[PDB]
Amino acid sequence: DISTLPRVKVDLVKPPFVHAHDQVAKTGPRVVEFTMTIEEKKLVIDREGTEIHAMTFNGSVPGPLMVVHENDYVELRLINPDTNTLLHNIDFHAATGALGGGALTQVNPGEETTLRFKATKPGVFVYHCAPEGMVPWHVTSGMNGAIMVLPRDGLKDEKGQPLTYDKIYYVGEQDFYVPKDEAGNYKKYETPGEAYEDAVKAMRTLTPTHIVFNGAVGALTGDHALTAAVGERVLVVHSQANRDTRPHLIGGHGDYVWATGKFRNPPDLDQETWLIPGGTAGAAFYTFRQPGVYAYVNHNLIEAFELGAAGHFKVTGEWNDDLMTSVVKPASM
Amino acid sequence: DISTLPRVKVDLVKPPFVHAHDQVAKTGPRVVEFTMTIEEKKLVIDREGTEIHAMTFNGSVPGPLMVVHENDYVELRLINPDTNTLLHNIDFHAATGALGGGALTQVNPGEETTLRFKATKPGVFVYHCAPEGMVPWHVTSGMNGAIMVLPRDGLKDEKGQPLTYDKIYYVGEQDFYVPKDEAGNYKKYETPGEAYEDAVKAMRTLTPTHIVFNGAVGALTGDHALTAAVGERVLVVHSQANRDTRPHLIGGHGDYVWATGKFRNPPDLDQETWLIPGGTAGAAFYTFRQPGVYAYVNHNLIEAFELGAAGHFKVTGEWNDDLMTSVVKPASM
Amino acid sequence: DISTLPRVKVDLVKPPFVHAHDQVAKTGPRVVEFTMTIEEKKLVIDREGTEIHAMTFNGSVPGPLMVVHENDYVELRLINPDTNTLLHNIDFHAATGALGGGALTQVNPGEETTLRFKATKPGVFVYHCAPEGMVPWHVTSGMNGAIMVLPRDGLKDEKGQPLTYDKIYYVGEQDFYVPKDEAGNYKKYETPGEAYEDAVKAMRTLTPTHIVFNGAVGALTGDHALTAAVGERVLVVHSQANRDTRPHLIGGHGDYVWATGKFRNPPDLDQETWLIPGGTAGAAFYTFRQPGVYAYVNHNLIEAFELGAAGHFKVTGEWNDDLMTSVVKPASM
Ligand SMILES: O=N[O-]
Ligand SMILES: O=N[O-]
Ligand SMILES: O=N[O-]
Ligand SMILES: [Cu+2]
Ligand SMILES: [Cu+2]
Ligand SMILES: [Cu+2]
Ligand SMILES: [Cu+2]
Ligand SMILES: [Cu+2]
Ligand SMILES: [Cu+2]
């Protein structure tokens, strides 16, 4: 009887950070309450100043990472303020029935809804908006995020021993399809209805104009670089709601990787690069062994370094010359 | 001595249905006899009325699913009627030697051939036409299907316990490359030889114009939606002979998935989405838990909802409010 | 203390051949010394005579396969002769720290450097040039190879029993992006700086003009076809530093496949086709069972047979009619 269960209210945080949680469940099953407010907003996505009309959960691209345990109930209050112009909904890949919730959560501007589902399968999962007839337009406008459903006894390695992270980040990767004119310059639009046919035409090229982490070129760099210390265990959750990606930590590895995100399966070990299919979340566990700057990319390097799918880690600590050293520094002889 | 084995004649059915078979082999090894007749035919592939010259096994795109057991012999009589114009052949990814049979099955119009091979490896496998010098043109004209080679003791889970399906469907996914003029409209052609250079040019874009299930936009919808009941175990075999896909059951999961189709490997559990590489068949097992309409898609949602890679299930039964419920229906407050 | 270890000098060979090594380590850990000389050179990559300015390690596309054992130290002397025009460096996906070595190996023309790293994880791994701000341009000019790090006790199957190859080949697959004019013809350039913006524009299409094995259309065919005998065990290492591929042995299988290349994981069995993500090396083990010609392809068949990603094996020995036979040869009746 769900009314006899504890309720716990979660207050979400902006990606790539993740709201506080316990790896190992410290209670029995709970109804875990979340609220998200849909926000249609202009976003500048590149260094050139290209501005799109983003469709967001909670103001961000991606939407925030939600975290529960297996056989908790997720109860989401989804708000679509009357400041928005479009109908929206939500499909959880973690959920069972009604198109993952999309059939039950259609909210016009000025409406709200509350959906509850049981998180019966452990893993990281995509969630995304999916309004009938307009699904890829919403998703590729940034209206997607992820949910992690931890096993109640936390993560385990390929032999059944615990894997405990010290830090977790969520990297949402977004393919955008900004319409172009015949000369190649990005077009802009005065209403969503006036944009729609050209959005469809741009999507049908299957060629993104931009592929970004955390909503913009360079978002996870500089003052917003990811951080870690030597010897810290870091879980990077990575989602792509629409298109394949191939994550890679430049200078590191995925020590344990669930490339298709589902924790009942043993992880793949020692990965250089892995394939997260479009429509999937994956998760990589790494223990840092060297300080300095790392890049974290989609290893189609064009997608990374020309189209935006690249972020950085700044790692503190001592350098290990046993693991790597310059024997003879670059010089002319 | 193969002449001392039983022979069994199979009569194929049109996808997405699958001819009758036993999961667990009820006989010893057999020579399993199949006949397919090649048919070149016009097909309308979209809602707009776009008509292509399809190249088919047995009249359908995809070709029918053939089913045998491990260490049976497949004996295929391949007929190319003199009503056809082209040379064709067949390559089984399940077979060993002679380019999978393609070197031994070259049939001009008005010829036939009979190939026999031993099905030594269990799995779902692509079969496709592959005439030297014209391979992607035949494949991307729809001239491909799949063959399932069941283990003699049926399917097993990741712990070695039986998995038995109640229903099986075969979803063939086809990338088409309909040539376009400079303005973007589809071109048509008076002979295959007059089409060939423009077919090659369209293919070399690597950008399909259409990506469809069972030969056409909307083929697995309406009166041809897939069906199941709550609690039924369903195996969906999915092939893509030329290009990657990423299947997803909207509202469900792949409870057990052989993403690259080979049953000696333990399945992946609880998948949201999985990657079937171009040139591969995969298979997903699911137990339905909720009634209603599901969509089954390639989760590049552009490929799904703009280019055609989407079908539906209609599922009967009782709704489980424990698994999902609307707590507060969409309303303004 | 690394100075107390044996040093062993390796003399590399041109792909697809692989320098001599022991599967099972016949010594303790060693410092394994390699030297590579960077060569910028013109290469003709297709049958039409299309000439690009390639950027190579040791004169070849791909660069040579390096082979060590787990917990050996790789010591690479990288030479950039003053006959070259560009700055280059090297990133090993096998290494830990400093962007895989790229931060420590920046060599202008007329410089050299020596990098040492510990090969702490067993697998096949990409190595590639990666100069800050110019990474995909160098990689997609051919400046990439692979390194195999064998377990000290050699390869093992999914049950822990030895897998020993008789022969090994390295197939480097290269996506090129030759700039095109408005009419579709390839452009040429008088200096690297004059080429750069058009190289970036061509890359941003995400549509390769050519996809080749061993540096050119048809490179692994004819007098340079791969060879084997019936009953020989063959390991094919396959890399793709920038873009996904889907290898397939036409007429065979991958009996044991590490699709993402890391030997601590059990291999996938009986694969028809597998996905090697861009930025990864994979490895397939097969025992040949039939003589004759095989094709080895990227099973996007357009990429294979139109864009160049296809090679051949010539296999000697006796034909097995139990495994495959023509029962009735193609004829009219
Ligand atoms: O290894 N850096 O792509
Ligand atoms: O979850 N529907 O793409
Ligand atoms: O099976 N040949 O693509
Ligand atoms: Cu929306
Ligand atoms: Cu979805
Ligand atoms: Cu054909
Ligand atoms: Cu094939
Ligand atoms: Cu370089
Ligand atoms: Cu790299």
DSSP assignment letter at B186: B
Nearest to B138 by CA among B81, B86, B83, B103: B86
Q: In the beta sheet, which residues pair with residue A269? A: A256
The response to whether B238 counts as a known ligand-binding position is no
Nearest to C129 by CA among C89, C96, C79: C89
Cβ–Cβ below 8 Å for B274 and A277: yes
User: Which of A250, A290, A315 best tests the C interface by mutation, with the highest count of C CBs <10 A?
Assistant: A250
- Cα separation, B104 vs B14, in Å, equals 26
Q: Are strands B292-298 and B247-250 parallel, antiparallel or unpaired?
A: antiparallel
Query: B131 CB under 6 A from ligand 3?
Result: no
Cβ–Cβ below 8 Å for B303 and A123: no
- Cα separation, C253 vs C274, in Å, equals 10
3 state SS for chain C: CHHHCCEEECCCCCCCCCCCCCCECCCCCCEEEEEEEEEEEEEECCCCCCEEEEEEECCECCCCEEEEECCCEEEEEEEECCCCCCCECCEECCCCCHHHHHHHCCECCCEEEEEEEECCCCEEEEEECCCCCCHHHHHHCCCEEEEEEECCECEECCCCCEECCCEEEEEEEEEECCCECCCCCECCCCCHHHHHHHHHHHHHCCCCCEEEECCECCCCCHHHCEEEECCCEEEEEEEECCCCECEEEECCCEEEEECCCCCCCCCEEEECECCECCCEEEEEEEECCCCEEEEEEECCHHHHHCCCCEEEEEEECCCCCCCEEEEEEEECC
Residue nearest to atom 1 of ligand 2 (CA): B250
Select the residue of C251, C319, C325 nearest B99 (Cβ to Cβ).
C251
Give yes or no for a contact between C77 and C254, defined as CB atoms under 8 angstroms apart. no
Cβ–Cβ below 8 Å for A277 and B295: no
- Ligand nearest, relative to CA of residue A252: 1
- Cα separation, C84 vs C40, in Å, equals 6
Atom of ligand 3 nearest to the CA of B135: 3
Q: Tokens 């870690």 map to which residue? A: A228
Cβ partners under 8 Å of residue B297, min gap 6: B247, B248, B250, B304, B305, B309, B310, B311
CA atoms within 13 A on the CB side of B271: 28
Give yes or no for a contact between C283 and C306, defined as CB atoms under 8 angstroms apart. no
C229 φ, ψ to 5°?
-115, 155
- Chain C residue with CA closest to A248: the answer is C279
* C35 burial level (CB within 10 Å; 0-12, 13-18, 19+): middle
Which pair of tokens denotes residue B118? 């031993």
Give yes or no for a contact between B237 and B210, defined as CB atoms under 8 angstroms apart. no
CA distances from A2 to A75, A116, A141, A194, B178 (A): 11, 11, 36, 46, 54
Way the structure was solved? X-ray
Give yes or no for a contact between A53 and A42, defined as CB atoms under 8 angstroms apart. yes
* A263 burial level (CB within 10 Å; 0-12, 13-18, 19+): buried
B204 φ, ψ to 5°?
-65, -15
Residue nearest to atom 2 of ligand 1 (CA): A250
Which pair of tokens denotes residue B11? 């009569």
- Cα separation, C241 vs C140, in Å, equals 8
Q: How far is the CA of B99 from the centre of ligand 3 (A)?
A: 7
Q: How many CB atoms within 10 Å of residue A261?
A: 29
Handedness of CA A67, A71, A72, A78 (dihedral sign): positive
- Cα separation, B245 vs B229, in Å, equals 27
Cβ–Cβ below 8 Å for B98 and C275: no
Looking at chain C, how many residues does it have? 333
Which pair of tokens denotes residue B241? 């002979």
Q: b/e string for C52-65 if b means 16 or more Cβ within 10 A?
A: bbbbbbbbbbbbbb
Cβ–Cβ below 8 Å for B278 and C274: no
DSSP assignment letter at A46: S
DSSP codes joined into one string, B239-260: EESSS-B-EEEET--EEEEETT
Q: In the beta sheet, which residues pair with residue C66? A: C147
- Preceding omega of A62 cis (within 30 degrees of 0): yes
Q: How far is the CA of C134 from the centre of ligand 8 (A)?
A: 8
Q: In the beta sheet, which residues pair with residue C186? A: C180
Asked about B224 being catalytic, the answer comes back as no
Select the residue of A207, A259, A273 nearest C205 (Cβ to Cβ).
A207
* Neighboring chain B residues of A280 at a CB cutoff of 8 Å: 246, 272-273, 299
Give the residues surrounding ligand 2 with Cβ less than 6 Å away.
A 91, 93, 100, 130; B 248, 250, 299
Alpha helices in A176-225 (DSSP H): 192-204
Enumerate residues preceding breaks in chain B (C to N > 2.5 Å). Answer: none
Q: Tokens 């989602």 map to which residue? A: A239
CA distances from A177 to A56, A135, A208, A311, B182 (A): 16, 14, 5, 21, 21
Query: B91 CB under 6 A from ligand 3?
Result: yes
Which pair of tokens denotes residue A151? 């096993």
The structural domains of chain A, ordered by start, are 1-151 (2.60.40.420), 152-318 (2.60.40.420)
- Cα separation, A137 vs A201, in Å, equals 11
Q: Tokens 């399932």 map to which residue? A: B148
- Chain C residue with CA closest to A331: the answer is C111
Cβ partners under 8 Å of residue C306, min gap 6: B136, B200, B203, B204
Give yes or no for a contact between A117 and A62, defined as CB atoms under 8 angstroms apart. no
Cβ–Cβ below 8 Å for C301 and B117: no
Cβ partners under 8 Å of residue A234, min gap 6: A165, A166, A167, A168, A169, A228, A285, A286, A287, A288
Query: B130 CB under 6 A from ligand 3?
Result: yes
The residues of C annotated as belonging to the active site are 88, 91, 93, 128-129, 138, 143, 248, 272-273, 299
DSSP codes joined into one string, B256-322: EEETT--TTSPPEEEESB--B-TTEEEEEEEE--S-EEEEEEESSHHHHHTTS-EEEEEEES---TT
Q: In the beta sheet, which residues pair with residue B146? A: B65, B126
Q: How many CB atoms within 10 Å of residue B137?
A: 24
Residue nearest to atom 3 of ligand 1 (CA): A250
The response to whether B36 counts as a known ligand-binding position is no
Handedness of CA B30, B35, B38, B41 (dihedral sign): negative
DSSP assignment letter at B64: P
Nearest to C12 by CA among C55, C73, C76: C76
Asked about A224 being catalytic, the answer comes back as no
CA atoms within 13 A on the CB side of B314: 7
Give yes or no for a contact between A66 and A20, defined as CB atoms under 8 angstroms apart. no
Residue C283: alpha-carbon gap to chain centroid: 10
Handedness of CA C54, C55, C60, C65 (dihedral sign): negative
Distance between C51 CA and the closest CA of chain A, angstroms:
22
- Cα separation, A2 vs A72, in Å, equals 10
Q: How far is the CA of B143 from the centre of ligand 6 (A)?
A: 6
Going by the annotation, the residues of the binding site of A for Cu cation are 88, 93, 128-129, 138, 143, 299
Q: b/e string for C159-192 if b means 16 or more Cβ within 10 A?
A: eeeebebebbbbbbbbbbbbbbeeeeebeeeeeb
Give yes or no for a contact between A109 and A84, defined as CB atoms under 8 angstroms apart. yes
Which pair of tokens denotes residue C268? 């996938």
Which pair of tokens denotes residue C66? 């390096």
Which pair of tokens denotes residue A146? 């992820």
Asked about A164 being catalytic, the answer comes back as no
Nearest to A60 by CA among A75, A91, A39: A39
> Using alpha carbons only, how large is chain C's radius of gyration in Å?
20
- Cα separation, A33 vs A12, in Å, equals 10
User: Which of A105, A204, A276, A300 best tests the B interface by mutation, with the highest count of B CBs <10 A?
Assistant: A204
CA distances from C215 to B96, C79, C174, C294 (A): 29, 21, 7, 20
Q: In the beta sheet, which residues pair with residue C269? A: C256
- Cα separation, C259 vs B275, in Å, equals 13
* Neighboring chain B residues of C295 at a CB cutoff of 8 Å: 99
* Neighboring chain C residues of A275 at a CB cutoff of 8 Å: 244, 260, 275, 277
Select the residue of A101, A112, A262 nearest B324 (Cβ to Cβ).
A101
CA distances from C306 to A95, B106, B132, B284, C211 (A): 43, 21, 12, 32, 9
Query: C76 CB under 6 A from ligand 1?
Result: no
- Cα separation, B57 vs B54, in Å, equals 10
Query: C91 CB under 6 A from ligand 1?
Result: yes
Q: b/e string for A13-46 if b means 16 or more Cβ within 10 A?
A: ebbbebeebebebeeebbbbbbbbbbbbeebebb
Q: How far is the CA of B88 from the centre of ligand 6 (A)?
A: 4
Residue nearest to atom 1 of ligand 3 (CA): C250
Which pair of tokens denotes residue A322? 């046993």
Distance between B7 CA and the closest CA of chain A, angstroms:
41
Cβ partners under 8 Å of residue C22, min gap 6: none
List chains adjacent to chain C, taking adjacency as at least 3 C-beta pairs closer than 8 Å. Answer: A, B
Distance between B208 CA and the closest CA of chain A, angstroms:
9
Q: How far is the CA of C300 from the centre of ligand 6 (A)?
A: 17
Q: How far is the CA of B53 from the centre of ligand 8 (A)?
A: 47
